[PDB]
């Protein structure tokens, strides 16, 4: 029974330790990727119209 309670505790600990940080990291990566994509698109548009003019 000691080890069964330890199983439950380590399940919850692994959740709080790696499962949620993984989701937070995924959200951070996709947010930063969105920012970088918008920045690159705007810079490319600026360069293109520079070349056109």
């Amino acid at each position: 029974a000691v080890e069964a309670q330890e199983i439950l505790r380590t399940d919850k600990e692994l959740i709080a330790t790696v499962r949620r940080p993984a989701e937070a990291e995924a959200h951070r990566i996709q947010q930063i990727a969105e920012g970088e994509k918008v920045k690159q698109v705007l810079l490319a548009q600026a360069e293109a119209e520079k070349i056109r003019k």
């Binding site: 600026a46 119209e49 520079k50 003019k53």
Partner: protein, 52 residues
């Protein structure tokens, strides 16, 4: 970029107009050169040859 393009456009247009100005001046200039050269006899051609 727009400012640079306007700068290039205006400077190029000005220098092209200046080229046209010297063009007209040089044409009206050379017309009289030809007119003057028309009145050259053998003495004048001899002078040119002995100067060159």
């Amino acid at each position: 970029a727009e400012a640079e393009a306007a700068s290039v456009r205006m400077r190029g247009e000005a220098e092209a107009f200046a080229i046209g100005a010297r063009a007209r001046a040089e044409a009206e200039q050379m017309a009289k050169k030809a007119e003057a050269f028309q009145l050259y006899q053998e003495a004048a051609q001899l002078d040119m040859l002995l100067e060159k």
